[PDB]
Structure formats: structure tokens, C-alpha cells
Design a protein around this ligand. Structure first.
Ligand SMILES: Cc1cc2nc3c(=O)[nH]c(=O)nc-3n(C[C@H](O)[C@H](O)[C@H](O)COP(=O)(O)OP(=O)(O)OC[C@H]3O[C@@H](n4cnc5c(N)ncnc54)[C@H](O)[C@@H]3O)c2cc1C
Ligand code: NA
Length: 448
């Protein structure tokens, strides 16, 4: 149990009651670091361990596709904690007052939470810190190597981040010890009154039919593992060659589970490394889930304006500035972008998959975002529209990987300089003709 995963947020007088785990990002009972040290603090100090979840008031900022996915997984989570004699308490409201009152009411001893580099998580931390006197600990339960330990600076490329991370797997890539149960110590209602609030804003087709199709991804910790096992057994070997083909379902399809923390990324890395497949296919998968996933946490942790034009590289910021008011071929508003009413059928098909399935293919996720920069009056508007569409309709949205992906597509973050072109500038360019030579585009639009 490496202590480098644990960092101190506020020092105080150790309390008396149960050690409270404030779960935010890693919604799982197994392979969850944050629970293990919470039990370790509960084992080496002889106190009960409890888990507290906050149903915040920003859920209406998204759709019912994310709300119902998260609550269904929470339903499975709390029955797994009951089997370990670990009670789970769910609060409705802003964590700044909910967490502080819970600690005082239950006389909690030490408060522990998992790590998330998002601005919203930080906002909740400051309010909680000012309202509590018990020790406050935080742990990186989402990354194989701690975000502050992989690097203490913003990495400008995957070229420089890869050797740094790859030098610390032997230190941190280790197996998970079993969850020790406590010695001795409704979700359906909140879901019902919840969806009744997001119902009038549900995405719909013309006549009356909701566009979302919820049978593609079953939520829950148990369902996440089955997706992982199916990916290793059936899609690992062909991943390297079929990574960039949207017409084939050769991806791991684990992003909604990883974003909600229903499955640990370290468990995925452990199973894939022990699995035997094509070496190029394996190295391609490990790069995506280790290098590119954890560099997004670094990007958001060391760039406060990660969702702004200020976080772009200097070469890119100058390049788009020289091409700021170049006469755009098309200019589409947010609603035209949202409903999929552009002149590009390939982009329209990408939005259709986003609207219907809630998870758009990774290769088209790069064409989709970069094309917004083409048909936006300014790069700031383009960054804006991409974030709004991503965080609203993506099951894996509102994630550090999302903002790093948008920054990569629009601002060239973690990329390099390419051929200068109008409007887009020096940013990497993806053309519709270029996609025709890479995969069968006609099949993509036909399906969506
Ligand atoms: C504009 C944009 C928005 C995105 N939105 C999200 C998002 O909200 N949440 C999210 O987790 N990923 C996001 N992605 C990153 C990437 O598209 C997804 O990781 C990947 O498509 C998820 O599908 P997968 O896990 O089934 O495929 P896989 O090829 O299997 O990827 C496996 C894991 O690696 C991660 N990953 C894969 N590609 C990237 C990448 N370019 N950057 C960072 N991580 C990656 C994902 O965590 C993923 O689960 C976004 C990428 C871009 C360019
Ligand atoms: Na906005």
C-alpha cells in the first residue's frame, strides 16, 4: 500500500466516529484505492469505515443518459458495500454544506476523498475545508501512478510524458489487496424525482421518440468487468489495426465505466499485460489507457484554464491569431451543430451516433471536434461548442480526457506543428477526402 498515493489537504484534530470516505470519482467497491486506505485508516486506528456520496445540484446540466447510468451503478455499489458491512449514505445538495454537516452530525474521525483535477471538484474542496476540523486526506484512485508523482509540471507532448510514466510502473503497477469488511457497525426515489426534472429537456427526434438508446452499455461494476473480458478475448488482437476504423466495433467500450470509476484502469492494465495477443495491438492499447488517459489528468491538474484558449501552446495561439478573422467557408450556430444540420454528411453521422448511442467513435471524435473549429467565428467559440456538446451527450463526458481531447483537436495540445492552412492555421487538419482513404465512410452514414 504505497503511501505516495495519499496526499494531505488539511491537518486537524483526529475525530472520534467513523472514518468517512467521500466518494466522488471512483464509484466502485473493488480495486478502489480510496476505499482501501480508508479501511487501512479504519484498520490501524480501530474505527468503522463509511462511504458518503453527494448527489450534487449540477446534474440538470447533463441529460438523463448520464444520470440514470450513474444511479444504476450506485444501486449495485451500495449492495456490494452492504455485503462488506460498509454502510453507504447518499446526500442531496451541494457538498460544501452536505459534507460539513455530515461530519459534525456523525462525529467523523478522518475525511478521505478520491482525486479529480476538475475545477468543479476543487470548488467543492475549498468549501469543505473551511467547514471541517477533522483531518482531510485525498488519494489518486483513478491513475496507475499518482498524478502529482508522474510529473509535477505540464507535459507538452506524449513523447516526453511516456518515458516518465513508463519508469514508474514497477513502483506502482501492483495488485489490489482484498477489501477487509468492517468488524461491526432510497436510490429509486431520487432517480424518480430526478429524471422528472430532466424529462422536458430530453433529446428527441421529430415526432415524439427519444433519441438515446440505452441498451448499448449496461451500467454497473459487474457489467464493466464483462466488457473488459469481452474486449480481451475478442477485440484485443485486432485493436492495433482496427483502432481507427469507425465501421467496426473493435474498441474496448470502457470509457463510460472508466469515467464514472466503475472499473479501475489499473485492473485493465493488469489483465491486458498478462494477456497474450499481438504486440503492436497491445502496445497501442496500453498507450491509450496509460499515456493519453493519464496525461489528461496532468493537463487539467497543472493548467487551471484547461477549458480555455489560454492553455493552448504558444505556437498554436499565435497561428490561430493570425488566422482569426479569415473568411470561414461555413458558420453554424450551436443549435444547427446540436441537431446535426451541417453540409458534411460525415460530421452529421458522427453527431447521430453521439445523439443515439452516447459514445461516438474515437477516430471520428477527432474529425468531429476539429470541424467545429472550421465552422466557428472564433477559436474560443469553437472550444465552447465542443465542450457543450461533449459534456451533454457523451456518457464519458465531463472528464479530464474530454477536455484534453478537445484541446488536442482545437488548440493542438500534446500535438505538433503541421502545414499552414487558412482558418485552421497550423493545427492538424482532417479532410473528408482523407477519411475516405482510411475507412469506408459510406457505411458509417448509412448506419447513422
Ligand atoms: C474531443 C474528444 C472528446 C473525448 N471525450 C472523452 C471523454 O469525455 N471521456 C473520455 O474518457 N475520453 C474521451 N475522449 C477520448 C477518447 O476518445 C476516448 O478515450 C475513447 O474514444 C473512448 O472510447 P474507448 O474507451 O471505447 O476506446 P479505447 O481506444 O479503448 O480507449 C481506451 C481508454 O483509453 C482512453 N482513451 C482513449 N483514447 C484517448 C484519448 N485520445 N485521450 C485520452 N484518453 C483516451 C480512454 O480512457 C479509454 O477508455 C475524447 C476524445 C476527444 C478527442
Ligand atoms: Na459556453
Amino acid at each position: 500500500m504505497n503511501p505516495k498515493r495519499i496526499r494531505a489537504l488539511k491537518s486537524g484534530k483526529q475525530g472520534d466516529g467513523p472514518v468517512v470516505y467521500w466518494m466522488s470519482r471512483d464509484q466502485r467497491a473493488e480495486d478502489n484505492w480510496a476505499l482501501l486506505f480508508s479501511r487501512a485508516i479504519a484498520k490501524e486506528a480501530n474505527v468503522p469505515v463509511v462511504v458518503v456520496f453527494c448527489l450534487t445540484d449540477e446534474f440538470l446540466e447533463a441529460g438523463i443518459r448520464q444520470y440514470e447510468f450513474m444511479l444504476k451503478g450506485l444501486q449495485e455499489l451500495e449492495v456490494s458495500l452492504s455485503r462488506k458491512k460498509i454502510p453507504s449514505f447518499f446526500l442531496r445538495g451541494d457538498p460544501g454544506e452536505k459534507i460539513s454537516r455530515f461530519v459534525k452530525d456523525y462525529n467523523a474521525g478522518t475525511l478521505v476523498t478520491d482525486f479529480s483535477p476538475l475545477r468543479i471538484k476543487n470548488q467543492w474542496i475549498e468549501k469543505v475545508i473551511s467547514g471541517i476540523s477533522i483531518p482531510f486526506f485525498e488519494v489518486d484512485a483513478h491513475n496507475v501512478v499518482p498524478c502529482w508523482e508522474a510529473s509535477q509540471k505540464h507535459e507538452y507532448a506524449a513523447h516526453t510524458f511516456r518515458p516518465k510514466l513508463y519508469a514508474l510502473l514497477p513502483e506502482f503497477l501492483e495488485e489490489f489487496p482484498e477489501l477487509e469488511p468492517n468488524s461491526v457497525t432510497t436510490l429509486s426515489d431520487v432517480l424518480e424525482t430526478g429524471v422528472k426534472a430532466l424529462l422536458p429537456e430530453r433529446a428527441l427526434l421529430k415526432n415524439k421518440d427519444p433519441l438515446f438508446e440505452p441498451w448499448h452499455f449496461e451500467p454497473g461494476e459487474k457489467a464493466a468487468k464483462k466488457v473488459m473480458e469481452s474486449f480481451i478475448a475478442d477485440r484485443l488482437d485486432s485493436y492495433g489495426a482496427l483502432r481507427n476504423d469507425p465501421t467496426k466495433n473493435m474498441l474496448s467500450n470502457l470509457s463510460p465505466y472508466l469515467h464514472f470509476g466503475q472499473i479501475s484502469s489499473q485492473r485493465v492494465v493488469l489483465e491486458v499485460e498478462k494477456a497474450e495477443s499481438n504486440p503492436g495491438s497491445k502496445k497501442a492499447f496500453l498507450d491509450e489507457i496509460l499515456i493519453w488517459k493519464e496525461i489528461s489528468d496532468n493537463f487539467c491538474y497543472y493548467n487551471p484554464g484547461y477549458d480555455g484558449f489560454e492553455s493552448f501552446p504558444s505556437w498554436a495561439k499565435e497561428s490561430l491569431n493570425a488566422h482569426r478573422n479569415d473568411v470561414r467557408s461555413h458558420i453554424y450556430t450551436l443549435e444547427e451543430f446540436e441537431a446535426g444540420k451541417t453540409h458534411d454528411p460525415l460530421w452529421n453521422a458522427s453527431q447521430m451516433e453521439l445523439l443515439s448511442t452516447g459514445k461516438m467513435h474515437g477516430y471520428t471524435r477527432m474529425y468531429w471536434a476539429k470541424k467545429i473549429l472550421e465552422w466557428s467565428e472564433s477559436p474560443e467559440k469553437a472550444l465552447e461548442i465542443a465542450i457543450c456538446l461533449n459534456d451533454r451527450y457523451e456518457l464519458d463526458g465531463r472528464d479530464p480526457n474530454g477536455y484534453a481531447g478537445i484541446a488536442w483537436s482545437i488548440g493542438g495540445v500534446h500535438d505538433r506543428a503541421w502545414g499552414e492552412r487558412e482558418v485552421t492555421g497550423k493545427i492538424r487538419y482532417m479532410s473528408y477526402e482523407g477519411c475516405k482513404r482510411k475507412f469506408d465512410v459510406k457505411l458509417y452514414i448509412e448506419k447513422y
